[PDB]
């Protein structure tokens, strides 16, 4: 048959790429030698086209002007600090070790100095639970307990723009506009609505998958479709 849509994706053609040239900033934590003597002032609050969430323009002491992944409650004029000795207030960034347990955090680093990887989407947050000289246990937004190096930096507070998901798109056009700002092909044609040549579920006199939807982890691309290595399906039991 023909390559399935999921296979066309990987080639990285225009249709599947994110409108990168239209994006504003790669939101990473600043690098500080040590000491913490790095503070800046929020100069503006802007919309981030890559995340449908606000972002903050900060002007640092040493003349550096950069956009920052903004937590809720950050405003123009506010002074933010980054470093070991940073104050424990919303919007500041310091290593997990300097953060008091039980405090909501966002933009958590996976490896110390990577600029942040976890809890960055609208209104989310990680929960710093356990401290130690060896490991800082953080609960990610998915509910998972993550063991991290206490040296991994993070920002105090929950990510801004919380509740974005609360409102329905209502119409195709609204989804369309959002989709145009992402690396995604939309709308979505169901496999079962296609011809056999185009998809493992295509074909038939009526619409139905011709086999069980639960596919093995070992299935090759072009065949891995439907419910991937599902431990279970449905709602009952």
């Amino acid at each position: 048959g023909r390559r399935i849509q999921g296979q066309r994706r990987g080639r990285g053609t225009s249709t599947f790429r994110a409108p990168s040239h239209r994006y504003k900033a790669d939101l990473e934590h600043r690098k500080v030698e040590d000491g913490d003597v790095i503070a800046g002032t929020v100069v503006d609050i802007e919309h981030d086209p890559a995340r449908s969430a606000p972002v903050a323009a900060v002007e640092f002491e040493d003349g550096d002007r950069r956009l920052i992944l903004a937590p809720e409650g950050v405003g123009v004029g506010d002074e933010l600090q980054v470093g070991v000795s940073a104050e424990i207030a919303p919007g500041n960034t310091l290593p997990l070790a300097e953060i008091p347990e039980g405090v909501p955090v966002c933009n958590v680093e996976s490896s110390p100095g990577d600029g942040g990887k976890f809890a960055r989407a609208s209104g989310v947050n990680a929960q710093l639970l356990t401290h130690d000289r060896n490991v800082a246990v953080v609960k990610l937004p998915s509910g998972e307990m993550k063991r991290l190096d206490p040296q991994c930096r993070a920002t105090i507070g929950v990510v801004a723009g919380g509740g974005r998901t609360d409102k329905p798109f209502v119409k195709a056009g609204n989804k369309h506009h959002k989709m145009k700002a992402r690396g995604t092909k939309w709308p979505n044609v169901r496999g079962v609505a296609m011809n056999a040549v185009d998809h493992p579920f295509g074909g038939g006199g009526r619409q139905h998958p011709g086999k069980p939807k639960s596919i093995s982890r070992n299935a090759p691309p072009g065949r891995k479709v439907g419910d991937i290595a599902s431990k279970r399906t449905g709602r009952g039991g």
């Binding site: 903004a70 809720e72 405003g75 123009v76 209104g123 723009g161 609360d166």
Partner: peptide, 10 residues
Amino acid sequence: DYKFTGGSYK
């Protein structure tokens, strides 16, 4: 004129 971050709709 205070400009700040909040929820998406609140």
